[PDB]
Amino acid sequence: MDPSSKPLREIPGSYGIPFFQPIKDRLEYFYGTGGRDEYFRSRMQKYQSTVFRANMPPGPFVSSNPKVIVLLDAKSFPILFDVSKVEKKDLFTGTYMPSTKLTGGYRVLSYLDPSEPRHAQLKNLLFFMLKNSSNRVIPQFETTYTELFEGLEAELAKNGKAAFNDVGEQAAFRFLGRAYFNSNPEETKLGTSAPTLISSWVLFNLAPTLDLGLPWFLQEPLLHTFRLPAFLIKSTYNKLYDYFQSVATPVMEQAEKLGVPKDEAVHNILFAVCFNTFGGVKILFPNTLKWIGLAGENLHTQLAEEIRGAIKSYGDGNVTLEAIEQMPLTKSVVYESLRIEPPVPPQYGKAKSNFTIESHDATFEVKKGEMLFGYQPFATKDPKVFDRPEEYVPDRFVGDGEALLKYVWWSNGPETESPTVENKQCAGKDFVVLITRLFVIELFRRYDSFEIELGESPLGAAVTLTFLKRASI
Numbered sequence: 001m002d003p004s005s006k007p008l009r010e011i012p013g014s015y016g017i018p019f020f021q022p023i024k025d026r027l028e029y030f031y032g033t034g035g036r037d038e039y040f041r042s043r044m045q046k047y048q049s050t051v052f053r054a055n056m057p058p059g060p061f062v063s064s065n066p067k068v069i070v071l072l073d074a075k076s077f078p079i080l081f082d083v084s085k086v087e088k089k090d091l092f093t094g095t096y097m098p099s100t101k102l103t104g105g106y107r108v109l110s111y112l113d114p115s116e117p118r119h120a121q122l123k124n125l126l127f128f129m130l131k132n133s134s135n136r137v138i139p140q141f142e143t144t145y146t147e148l149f150e151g152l153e154a155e156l157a158k159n160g161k162a163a164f165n166d167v168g169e170q171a172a173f174r175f176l177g178r179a180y181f182n183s184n185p186e187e188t189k190l191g192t193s194a195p196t197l198i199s200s201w202v203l204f205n206l207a208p209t210l211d212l213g214l215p216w217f218l219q220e221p222l223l224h225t226f227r228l229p230a231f232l233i234k235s236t237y238n239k240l241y242d243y244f245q246s247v248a249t250p251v252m253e254q255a256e257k258l259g260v261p262k263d264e265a266v267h268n269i270l271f272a273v274c275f276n277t278f279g280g281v282k283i284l285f286p287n288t289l290k291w292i293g294l295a296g297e298n299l300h301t302q303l304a305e306e307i308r309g310a311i312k313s314y315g316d317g318n319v320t321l322e323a324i325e326q327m328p329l330t331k332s333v334v335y336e337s338l339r340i341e342p343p344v345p346p347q348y349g350k351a352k353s354n355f356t357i358e359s360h361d362a363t364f365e366v367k368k369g370e371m372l373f374g375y376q377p378f379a380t381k382d383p384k385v386f387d388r389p390e391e392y393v394p395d396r397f398v399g400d401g402e403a404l405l406k407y408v409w410w411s412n413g414p415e416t417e418s419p420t421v422e423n424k425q426c427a428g429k430d431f432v433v434l435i436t437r438l439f440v441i442e443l444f445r446r447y448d449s450f451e452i453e454l455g456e457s458p459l460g461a462a463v464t465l466t467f468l469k470r471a472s473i
């Protein structure tokens with residue numbers, strides 16, 4: 001509607017009694033009926049607004065300031081991408097930042113504002129790492145995921161069911177080592193334990209804001225009130241560090257050229273691969289498998305046809321970037337997975353000055369220093385942007401629908417924009433889109449269709465294969 005019809009109003013909501021309310025609120029957030037989605041929906045209903053004040057976890061001792069302004073609609077949300085208006089310093093994980101003792105004593109790239117020289121240096125370093133792996137991406141993905149599928153197939157044939165997540169995570173890390181460093185981590189001292197080592201380390205970092213499914217009387221006192229001692233995970237972290245220090249030589253050498261010490265470079269590479277990359281794929285691949293599986297054989301047949309046809313005609317028998325460009329449905333399927341279920345839901349930004357923001361029916365004033373918070377899942381399901389927003393529509397982005405990519409924000413920026421040293425958009429944006437398309441491609445080069453069953457998991461979606469129809473033999 002016309003902005004002149006959106007009156008300037010006070011931001012609804014209150015923070016309540018300082019120490020007390022944030023604790024009561026995090027209890028609602030983690031144990032209230034409906035979970036965090038209801039935490040946000042109930043407030044939207046209560047205040048009849050997609051913009052409101054609220055306290056956010058972790059609260060008290062871990063976080064010195066739980067107060068934020070929540071943004072749930074597609075009109076207000078984009079302010080979080082505007083680095084000229086919002087500061088993005090030490091807020092990668094929200095209203096608190098994990099101890100730097102968990103990251104070699106350094107404040108790694110993800111926590112740096114673009115105004116910091118190191119942000120440009122380190123992000124350029126990661127761009128180098130990504131470009132350097134370009135020639136290995138497709139071949140190594142094919143090799144790694146063929147191994148994964150052969151394994152799942154064998155498990156299914158012998159047991160009747162095959163859980164995806166675990167072996168899928170092992171495959172993800174195996175692929176990353178091969179693509180980024182031309183190294184199979186399973187041949188090193190890491191063996192097949194990388195996923196377990198990483199998960200433990202990530203837990204130490206994020207425990208304050210993670211719901212592990214434990215009862216409140218156990219989870220609150222031991223995970224949500226105090227930070228877990230960093231010296232306890234040092235041993236585990238060192239195993240990971242030793243791996244990267246030995247295989248990331250070319251990236252470490254480029255780091256020196258950019259003015260970054262080798263040690264700092266390794267800690268940042270470790271973080272980018274284990275935290276950013278692995279953690280994201282651990283969530284995205286199972287979710288994508290889920291949405292495609294729930295779509296039915298009709299979609300499966302169309303994807304198989306498109307994928308195999310493009311490979312034969314444009315790839316001359318092989319998977320090439322040129323071939324992928326000619327797979328419109330596959331591209332849309334991946335974008336729809338990223339829209340309907342953003343792998344990383346929370347984005348934060350702190351106001352650098354006083355300015356105005358607007359929802360679909362009101363105008364609000366934001367004061368310098370206030371923490372803005374956006375819950376992406378609600379914003380990318382805004383009915384004023386997407387028809388049937390709660391439904392997975394496979395071809396939503398095909399043809400004219402491509403214009404809607406301006407509203408796909410999984411990477412902390414419009415899908416149409418590229419990450420740069422000037423913004424805080426995911427450095428590996430194009431890489432994740434490519435590998436997720438490769439995941440779908442490898443799946444349909446081998447199978448005509450598949451069936452799954454879903455389980456109740458805390459960190460994402462638990463997917464189990466119940467049937468795999470082979471394309472040949």
Ligand code: HEM
Nearest residue numbers: 109110272276277280281343344412423424426427428432
């Ligand atoms: C599909 C998997 C991935 C997802 C869902 C994802 C998501 C995100 C999100 C939401 C942010 C913004 C965080 C914030 O400031 O609030 C981000 C930042 C970032 N991501 Fe990713 N990411 C993925 C894969 C990767 C990969 C593979 C790399 C590369 C090694 C990467 C590197 C980065 C970096 C370096 C930043 C911070 C950039 C900066 O400080 O400007 N990401 N990612």
